[PDB]
Design a protein around this motif. Structure first.
Motif, short mmCIF file in Angstrom:
data_model
loop_
_atom_site.label_atom_id
_atom_site.label_comp_id
_atom_site.label_asym_id
_atom_site.label_seq_id
_atom_site.Cartn_x
_atom_site.Cartn_y
_atom_site.Cartn_z
N UNK A 215 0.96 -1.13 -0.01
CA UNK A 215 -0.17 0.06 -0.02
C UNK A 215 0.93 1.29 0.28
N UNK B 121 4.28 1.52 -1.63
CA UNK B 121 5.18 1.63 -2.86
C UNK B 121 4.72 2.45 -3.62
N UNK B 122 3.12 2.83 -3.80
CA UNK B 122 2.56 3.79 -4.52
C UNK B 122 2.88 5.22 -4.02
N UNK B 123 3.35 5.37 -2.96
CA UNK B 123 3.26 6.61 -2.39
C UNK B 123 4.92 7.14 -2.11
N UNK C 133 -4.21 11.17 -3.98
CA UNK C 133 -4.57 9.63 -3.70
C UNK C 133 -4.54 9.40 -2.17
#
Lengths: 5, 143, 143, 143, 143, 5
Positions: free
Chosen positions: E5, E7-9, E50
């Motif tokens: 959750x 890695x996208x940030x 996001x």
């Protein structure tokens, strides 16, 4: 036809 | 779906909750004045105003409710039972439709401004204690 | 007065008298549709269209009719006559309100031009005898 | 906090409940689809889309609920109440996540506009009587 | 499929494992903070960020987990293992959701740069043996 | 509505 209360 | 029939016109059920139930005139009287004053336009093939549009539907729905309760009481042989039925009608749906017809007829006749200011002024008058409550209640007038 | 609830939008009760009862969806279905599609605007504090106005009024009137029917069925303790009176209610007023909701929803969706042409064509099709009309009826849809 | 998972996207629980519950595919099938079509984009270190973010989080929440349910099923012994909890899950959370995965996958594949218009169309369709609708159910396609 | 959750940030479960488990605030306090500071953006019809998307989804998943566990506890007759159930729920999912809420709220309030640097510096502080680490740990702050 | 462990 009917009747009540 | 929760719909307020006056939120569209600038009012609310809480703003017309100011006026008491005993205040509104009879449906007979309201339909009489509706005819006498706006029959040609309610029977017209025109969007004359949202008030006309709403009042037409209100009149037709009152007609439908009347047919319903009439057919019902007729199928009901006992007078106490049918009288109970029409009492409940007059209390609940009669009051709803009196509020509605009064609002629309009054607004057509006088104005949104006048009718909403009348609502607040009547709230003042009815909230005032009796010792200081003018006996001349507020009245709508084109005069 | 004698008011036609469609004359103001460009139709009549004799243009929608041809559509059979089998044509119209349930009132529950039509109200679900109205909600899902136009609830944002029906609960809005605006005159968005005479269709929105009329549909608001129709929904409120059906609600009042339902409250009356439920109260009556509860107070009355005879299920046979209960079903009889609710059968009257449906057969008579559910048909009217289905016509009404359908007409307003369909006008909003498609257009008055389109809905009136469709009513004309469906009437041609339904006045025609089955031996001489196509087997499948005209269709108003968004694919 | 009254959050709607779809309001940020252009839909609502009311609109996705405008389709029947037996229409949405299984969670297994939808996860297989998500893998096949967007695994490398979901496992990516990028904000590829709000739909991607939401899909990631929903997949993880489903994983958590599954772990909990498996642990609970190990704990509880009676197949009766075990199938009962499975039923409750697949009835409430199963459906929520089916709708959510369907919405996000379908929007990623087809378009938000396409998917929302499809919701509307398929609801009107499933509510319209058969003799007056297109006979084949709407299908969402790329070809 | 294996989704991280963070890695996208710009982070990972290893970076957020520098912080111990007893470091993260209660889920109630983190939700209170989320409300206080971003309620109107999380309840909004906008892709505000996001982080907002993720936080909405996480709040909903937590709600679903709590709903399941509550229905369970109330439908069961044995209040003894109701201690181990909450033990597991907390120990496993509450930590995940605390880590998640913390990361999102902190990266909204302070920033990605600041939160990554905080993670690194707190890893230093906590890797350091107690005989040589200051008492003024790194604190995430605007002052 | 029955539990174990």
């Amino acid at each position: 036809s009917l009747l009540g209360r | 779906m929760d719909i307020d029939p006056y939120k569209e016109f600038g009012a609310t059920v809480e703003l017309l909750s100011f006026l008491p139930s005993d205040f509104f005139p009879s449906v007979r009287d309201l339909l009489d004045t509706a005819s006498a004053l706006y029959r040609e336009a309610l029977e017209s093939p025109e969007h004359c105003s949202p008030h006309h549009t709403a009042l037409r539907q209100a009149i037709l729905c009152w007609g439908e409710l009347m047919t319903l309760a009439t057919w019902v009481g007729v199928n009901l042989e006992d007078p106490a039972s049918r009288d109970l039925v029409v009492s409940y009608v007059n209390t609940n749906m009669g009051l709803k439709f009196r509020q509605l017809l009064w609002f629309h007829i009054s607004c057509l006749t006088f104005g949104r401004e006048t009718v909403i200011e009348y609502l607040v002024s009547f709230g003042v008058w009815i909230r005032t204690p009796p010792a200081y409550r003018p006996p001349n209640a507020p009245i709508l007038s084109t005069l």
